Amino acid sequence: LDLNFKLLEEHLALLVE
Amino acid sequence: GPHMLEREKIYQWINELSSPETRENALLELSKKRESVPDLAPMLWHSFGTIAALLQEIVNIYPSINPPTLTAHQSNRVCNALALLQCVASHPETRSAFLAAHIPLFLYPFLHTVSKTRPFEYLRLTSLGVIGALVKTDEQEVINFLLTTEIIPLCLRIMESGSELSKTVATFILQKILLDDTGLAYICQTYERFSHVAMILGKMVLQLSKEPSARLLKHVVRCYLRLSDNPRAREALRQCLPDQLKDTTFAQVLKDDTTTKRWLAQLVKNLQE
């Protein structure tokens, strides 16, 4: 889950900005 | 050449989503080529049983919600289908028919959770990411949908509770709704809708003075600014605005955030009378 959790976090970081 | 074998590998995987014996591998292999292939979303929608299969994947984990027994394998599996549903919701060819079937209504159970376990947080964020994808299109249908489905009460829960990332994405979703004029008018129509939002935002301010988050503070300020654009809302905010926004509480944190300093500056100027 780790990889998918991390890459998902990076993705959400761009989205909100 | 090699692309034709790749196209057929996807064609078979899509077909393999139907049977439950072959879904897991095809869910994995297609959630990887989501950005690689452009026409996945129209092919996913217009093929047989494929959208139904992903909907089954979602409901199939509903028992693991209450009581919370969500495994890591369950979470990664059901999110890989959520990833494919985000592809359908992103592609313009399929977005409206996707909302026409009210498909996001089945991720709302995931936003109600509070478990804070990594399988639940992954589910919570991936579900939030799907909604954040819709609000970024800035389509009129997206705003008109979310208001009627009562996603705002779902966000406000995640904005008070939950992680900082979850708090940020939820506020961003709320923010994008407020940016639309229709989203503002809806929230400032009744007092129960305004006060519920404003009290959420106030309780978030106190939490940020003790647990600071740069991105959270940014989008919280932007939400307050957008509310100040409404006449009856601007009045209620002059007496309701947290004093920590008015004073020096967030000064050190915002010293280098030019865009947030300007928004807060305008907010106090907007309420000025």
Partner: protein, 235 residues
């Protein structure tokens, strides 16, 4: 782990729950006051009746629109309303029961435990601080033990009301597939038959005939495994 099966529970009356109620024999309240064991059947069925009607209507509401659009889209090139009706009902029972379980659990556990606390207090009357904790501990234990029972009851109520009302919303499509039979032709949605032909790859295209079993496996699985219930068969 699902305790019950769809057939095990009867919905005709609220008394269909009493045979399945699981009362833990080691509850300290009933150890000192066994007469209070009789408030449980009532308190549980009070909670299940105050929530069954609001939950059923909301559950079909969220499931209905989704269920009609996916089934119409998927069978738009099939002229046999028999297969579409069967598949549509299979997928409603699975989705409605799911929407019920999410809507039912959290309030039911509170409604059960709270109803037990007042029914317990009404007969005890004295309400000593010990007898209090005896009540909340008993009401909590009993609510947790019988939450799964009462939700399957509301689930089954929704699933049985969901059938007839889907037949209303799918009535239009049922007519077109038998009308075309009266005119000696297959039914084929003009818009879908165009899109498939013009834009869809062959390996994933909607065939103009009926759906192949092995491609209908999704809709069969909607009936094999229903949320909150034991699978009828093992495959």
């Amino acid at each position: 782990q699902p305790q019950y099966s769809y057939h095990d529970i009867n919905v005709y009356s609220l008394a269909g729950l009493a045979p399945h109620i699981t009362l833990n024999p080691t509850i300290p309240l009933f150890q000192a006051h066994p007469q209070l064991k009789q408030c449980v059947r009532q308190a549980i069925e009070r909670a299940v009746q105050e929530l069954v009607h609001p939950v059923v209507d909301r559950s079909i509401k969220i499931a209905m629109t989704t269920c009609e659009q996916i089934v119409r889209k998927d069978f738009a090139l099939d002229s046999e309303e028999s297969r579409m009706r069967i598949a549509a009902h299979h997928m409603m029972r699975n989705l409605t029961a799911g929407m019920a379980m999410i809507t039912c659990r959290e309030p039911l556990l509170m409604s059960i435990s709270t109803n037990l606390k007042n029914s317990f207090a009404s007969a005890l009357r004295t309400a000593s601080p010990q007898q209090r904790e005896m009540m909340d501990q008993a009401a909590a234990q009993l609510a947790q033990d019988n939450c799964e029972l009462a939700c399957c009851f509301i689930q089954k109520t929704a699933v049985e009301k969901a059938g007839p009302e889907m037949d209303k919303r799918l009535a239009t499509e049922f007519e077109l597939r038998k009308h075309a039979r009266q005119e000696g032709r297959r039914y084929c949605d003009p818009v879908v038959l165009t899109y498939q032909a013009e834009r869809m790859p062959e390996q994933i295209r909607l065939k103009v005939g009926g759906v192949d079993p092995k491609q209908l496996a999704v809709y069969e699985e909607f009936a094999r495994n229903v949320p909150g219930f034991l699978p009828t068969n093992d495959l």
